[PDB]
Design an enzyme around this catalytic site. Structure first.
Site, PDB file in Angstrom:
ATOM      1  N   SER C 366       0.892  -1.125   0.000  1.00 33.98           N
ATOM      2  CA  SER C 366       0.000   0.000   0.000  1.00 33.98           C
ATOM      3  C   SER C 366       0.921   1.161   0.000  1.00 33.98           C
ATOM      4  N   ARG C 367       0.760   2.079  -0.965  1.00 34.42           N
ATOM      5  CA  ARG C 367       1.668   3.179  -1.099  1.00 34.42           C
ATOM      6  C   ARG C 367       1.129   4.392  -0.417  1.00 34.42           C
ATOM      7  N   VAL C 368      -0.135   4.377   0.055  1.00 31.82           N
ATOM      8  CA  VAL C 368      -0.687   5.507   0.755  1.00 31.82           C
ATOM      9  C   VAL C 368      -0.833   5.111   2.182  1.00 31.82           C
ATOM     10  N   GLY C 369      -0.867   3.790   2.443  1.00 32.91           N
ATOM     11  CA  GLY C 369      -0.603   3.162   3.714  1.00 32.91           C
ATOM     12  C   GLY C 369      -1.256   3.779   4.910  1.00 32.91           C
TER      13      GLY C 369
END
Lengths: 53, 470, 499
Positions: C366-369
């Site tokens: 997840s890059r927005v995590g």
């Protein structure tokens, strides 16, 4: 004495195995990478040939 | 004669273009006939190229056409004969009785191109067909009104599987069936014709409970493409107008895809990836969408699919892969292990294998089978090099159970009495759930391994234990 | 009744007026009619044939304008009036589309009467800019335990659902739609995500099943399903996600929240290929249309999270990509992987191994995590990420004479992995995600044997409901776990484990 030597040898041997296997990974990785590139190019040429006509 | 007369302009390959006279241009998808010493070549109008020149695909051989030879227009898409008088005929792409029973006594003709039933028409269903084949019944049951799909390799025993299926499902099924063969060998064709004459499905004294539309792979590249469509229309007549259930069966449907590749190339469309037609998606769609269980009736397709060079990532099997409800992938490896049926247990998935749908007991038993086999597959690598000399007590039990389950799948078939000779066996649905349940519980983990090979239910496993005991 | 409605309809058609521009088809083949005429034609404008098929005019060529037919070839036949509709492709958009299954054009295909809509907006409009967008900051709880803890999904950031062919990819997505019912039902209008599911290239039977499933879980009432089925013509399939985005825009612009799940962009790609190659536009890599990166990028960037200046709307997106044989090096997957801002990678092996949802914990990111994840759920599941990481590494060591430390990892790890399974087609409330995960994290369930993990899960929920639904309600509403709440929770778990 023997049992210790045996298990010690097995550790040594399996260690050298891991190294040898690593070398094979690296060698086949280069082959894989080349092979992958070649497929893309060869396929591309076929499409081009068709369009050109 | 009609002022609709066209003069051939170019006999190319299968592509033969006709140059009709002023304003009258036969519409896309209509059918032109050219009277020939052979009989009638039917050419389907497939593009309009402007300046009163249509470009059509031939559906019979193009040899001997003489440039400028007068071409009459039928006026609509290839119009087949349909009826209940189409039972027990063998009709070909152009819908002529090729079984020489004399003229098909059809009341109606219908077009080969008709739009699939609309979104409104669709109606959900879920009923469980009983295949009577152990691997199929437990691990991915087939469902009535579905679109069952016999995906499998090249020569992985596809024919044997299909033959067994016809014996079970066809006889069981109440409605008529249409067995339609798109591009499969005429040796296979004669065998099927003979086999169902023997089995009495085709009773040419009585009334046949099946119709045939055999277009075989000696037919011109065009005909192979729209032969599938010919078959669809016979099924549609049954489904809609006559209101009965149907059980359309087409074989091998990869050949339909393959056929489409050929006429794409000839039509001159820039070939797409791995040489498939640009219209790959939509062509699959037109065939698949048409065959569905409407509120009118129910048609349950069973379609064989041939996976070229046993690679299911090839675009043609993969395109087919989406549309079919209850996949069974017959794999070469599983065949080599000697398991017949050759259905690969860890790759067969049905979308009506759902817990509610198949019942909680069925679901649990089958889920346990899947996990057990999958673990064994994972362990296979470790067993290969290291040995079983560091696999735990639990692992050893899993290997033993899995090996027993693995070979419990094989079941001798009724048409494999000339391919084997061990009498065929058909277990009940309930019986398969029970018999596998026992194995998993380890109630028969005292039985030697070879007594699971080529047996029926649990009762048979016990019987083979006795046989070995002697 | 019906007679009155028909009488209204005949009355409701009136005589026409002189219609500017006309064409005559020059040649119509391959579903690519090429019309000579149409002197002023806006690019991509919708043009209507004599027959009644509609088309758009993708190629405006120097002497002919190449319309693409939105229906069967048979409909158009060489030389025939080609009327100019005069409005570039636009679809009805509005609050009123809620609960109707509509096709790409926008026509009601659900058959529940005319679609009442508040605007028609164009289907190619450009994505929110640098200054309009404000960073993601509101969790979207999908309700699957694995998604919600392992890979948090926040409002307004596209995240891929890339996975192996027919491993019930759609199921993972459909679950998200169901969980949104919980927030949706209420009265807090800064909580309702109004989902739109875009079924592109799926057989009409499959989409019928989808419709029924949504009705069954009483979920059509915040769903709009733009469906362009496999049967529908290749232009309709092409315009299907683009159209869908426009449906989403009403929600984003008016300041609601919404999640549009494009399923599956792999088939979107195939449709674009069909159009381009048939229009003879230059071919390109892997025989996919030349600008294919550009097409996918346009679609996926319409998703955004609007700034507080711009009304604080959102438009979460979740494209689904079908990986052919799991080869994530393939041109259509690779392009999409780059474009997206996250991945969930469903693995076939896991699916077979009974882990359903089959999220491969390792290969998902997840890059927005941490912007997402409910604050409560974040606290008690930071640990969960780390524990599983160890379990993965020590996984292969499960083939003898193993250190006590290694064995501790194995026990905890096996139990966690078993714990994170979720029964298909049922979502699970966030207020019960935090308790269940808490138990595994605190190691209470380490002792419980694997076969009983499942039984424990359901039991724990009932136990929590009976013993302390005060605790549950506090967890839900406070939404942040204070030390005192974690205290009460520790006790509750101790009590539960003891029984």
């Amino acid at each position: 004495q023997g049992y210790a030597a045996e298990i010690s040898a097995r550790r040594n041997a399996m260690d050298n195995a891991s190294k040898n296997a690593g070398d094979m990974i690296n060698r086949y990785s280069i082959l894989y990478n080349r092979t992958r590139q070649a497929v893309i190019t060869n396929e591309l040429v076929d499409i081009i040939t068709g369009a050109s006509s | 004669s009609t002022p609709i007369t066209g003069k051939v302009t170019a006999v190319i390959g299968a592509i033969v273009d006709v140059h009709f006279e002023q304003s009258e241009l036969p519409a896309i998808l209509n059918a032109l006939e050219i009277k020939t010493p052979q009989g009638k070549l039917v050419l389907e109008v497939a593009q309009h190229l402007g300046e009163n020149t249509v470009r059509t695909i031939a559906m019979d051989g193009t040899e001997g056409l003489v440039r400028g030879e007068k071409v009459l227009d039928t006026g609509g898409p290839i119009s087949v004969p349909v009826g209940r008088e189409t039972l027990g005929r063998i009709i070909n792409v152009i819908g002529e009785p090729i079984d020489e029973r004399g003229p098909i006594k059809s009341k109606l003709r219908k077009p080969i191109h008709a739009d699939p039933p609309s979104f409104a028409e669709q109606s959900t269903s879920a009923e469980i067909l009983e295949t009577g084949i152990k691997v199929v019944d437990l691990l991915a049951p087939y469902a009535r009104g579905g679109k069952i799909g016999l995906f499998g390799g090249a020569g992985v025993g596809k024919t044997v599987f299909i033959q067994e299926l016809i014996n079970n499902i066809a006889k069981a099924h109440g409605g008529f069936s249409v067995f339609t063969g798109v591009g499969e060998r005429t040796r296979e064709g004669n065998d099927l014709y003979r086999e169902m004459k023997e089995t009495g499905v085709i009773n040419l004294e009585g009334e046949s409970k099946v119709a045939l539309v055999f277009g075989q792979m000696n037919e011109p590249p065009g005909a192979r493409a729209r032969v599938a469509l010919t078959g669809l229309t016979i099924a549609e007549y049954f489904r809609d107008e006559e209101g009965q259930d149907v059980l359309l069966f087409i074989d091998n449907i990869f050949r339909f895809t393959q056929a489409g590749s050929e006429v794409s190339a000839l039509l001159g469309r820039i070939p797409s990836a791995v040489g498939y037609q640009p219209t790959l998606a939509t062509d699959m769609g037109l065939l698949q969408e048409r065959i569905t269980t409407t509120k009118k009736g129910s048609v349950t397709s069973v379609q064989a699919v041939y996976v070229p060079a046993d690679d299911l990532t090839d675009p043609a099997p993969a395109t087919t892969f989406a549309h079919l409800d209850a996949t069974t992938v017959l794999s070469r490896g599983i065949s080599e292990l000697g398991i017949y049926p050759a259905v690969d247990p860890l790759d067969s998935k049905s979308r009506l294998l759902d817990a509610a749908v198949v019942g909680q007991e069925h679901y649990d038993v089958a889920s346990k089978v899947q996990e057990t086999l999958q673990t064994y597959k994972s362990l296979q690598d470790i067993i290969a090099i290291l040995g079983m000399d560091e696999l735990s007590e639990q692992d050893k039990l899993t290997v033993e159970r899995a090996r027993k389950i693995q070979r419990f799948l094989s079941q001798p078939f009724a048409v494999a009495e000339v391919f084997t000779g061990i009498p065929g066996k058909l277990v009940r649905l309930k019986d398969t759930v029970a018999s596998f349940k026992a194995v998993l519980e380890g109630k028969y983990d005292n039985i030697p391994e070879h007594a699971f090979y080529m047996v029926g239910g649990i009762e048979d496993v016990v019987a083979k234990a006795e046989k070995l005991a002697a | 009744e019906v007679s009155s409605i028909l009488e209204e309809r005949i009355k409701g058609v009136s005589d026409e007026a002189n219609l500017n521009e006309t064409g005559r088809v020059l040649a119509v083949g391959d579903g690519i009619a090429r019309v000579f005429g149409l002197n002023n034609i806006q690019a991509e404008e919708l043009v209507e044939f004599s027959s009644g098929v509609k088309g758009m005019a993708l190629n405006l060529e120097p002497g002919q304008v190449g319309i693409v037919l939105f229906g069967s070839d048979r409909l158009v036949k060489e030389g025939e009036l080609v009327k100019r509709t005069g409005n570039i492709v636009d679809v009805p958009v509005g609050p009123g589309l809620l609960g109707r299954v509509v096709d790409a054009l926008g026509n009601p295909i659900d058959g529940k009467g005319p679609i009442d809509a508040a605007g028609r907006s164009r289907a190619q409009v450009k994505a929110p800019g640098i200054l309009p967008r404000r960073s993601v900051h509101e969790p979207v709880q999908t309700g699957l335990k694995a998604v919600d803890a392992l890979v948090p999904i926040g409002r307004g950031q596209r995240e891929l659902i890339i996975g192996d062919r027919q491993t019930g990819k759609t199921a993972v997505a459909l679950d998200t739609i169901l969980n949104q019912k919980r927030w949706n039902n209420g009265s807090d209008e800064s909580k309702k995500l109004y989902c739109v599911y875009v079924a592109v290239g799926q057989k009409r039977s499959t989409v019928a099943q989808l419709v029924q499933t949504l009705e069954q879980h009483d979920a059509m009432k915040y769903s709009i399903i733009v469906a362009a089925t496999a049967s529908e013509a290749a232009p309709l399939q092409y315009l299907a996600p683009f159209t869908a985005a426009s449906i989403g825009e009403w929600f984003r612009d008016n300041g609601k929240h919404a999640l549009i799940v494009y399923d599956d962009l792999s088939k979107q790609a195939v449709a674009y290929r069909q159009l381009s190659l048939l229009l003879r536009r230059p071919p390109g890599r892997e025989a996919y249309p030349g600008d294919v990166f550009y097409l996918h990028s346009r679609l996926l960037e319409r998703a955004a999270k609007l700034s507080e200046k711009e009304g604080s709307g959102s438009l979460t997106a979740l494209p689904v990509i079908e990986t052919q044989g799991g080869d994530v090096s393939a041109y259509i997957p690779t392009n999409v992987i780059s474009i997206t801002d996250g991945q969930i990678f469903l693995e076939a092996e896991l699916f077979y191994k009974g882990i359903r949802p089959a999220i491969n914990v390792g290969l998902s990111v997840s890059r927005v995590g941490s912007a997402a994840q409910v604050k409560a759920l974040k606290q008690v599941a930071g640990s969960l990420k780390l524990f599983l990481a160890q379990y993965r590494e020590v996984a292969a060591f499960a083939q003898s004479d193993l250190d006590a430390s290694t064995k501790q990892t194995l026990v905890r790890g096996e139990r966690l992995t078993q714990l994170l399974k979720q029964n298909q087609y049922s979502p699970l409330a966030t207020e019960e995600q935090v308790p269940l995960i808490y138990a595994g994290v605190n190691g209470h369930l380490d002792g419980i044997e694997l076969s009983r993990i499942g039984e424990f899960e359901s039991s724990f929920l009932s136990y929590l409901k009976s013993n302390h639904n005060e605790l549950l309600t506090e967890i839900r509403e406070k939404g942040e776990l204070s030390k005192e709440l974690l205290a009460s929770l520790k006790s509750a778990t101790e009590s539960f484990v003891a029984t």
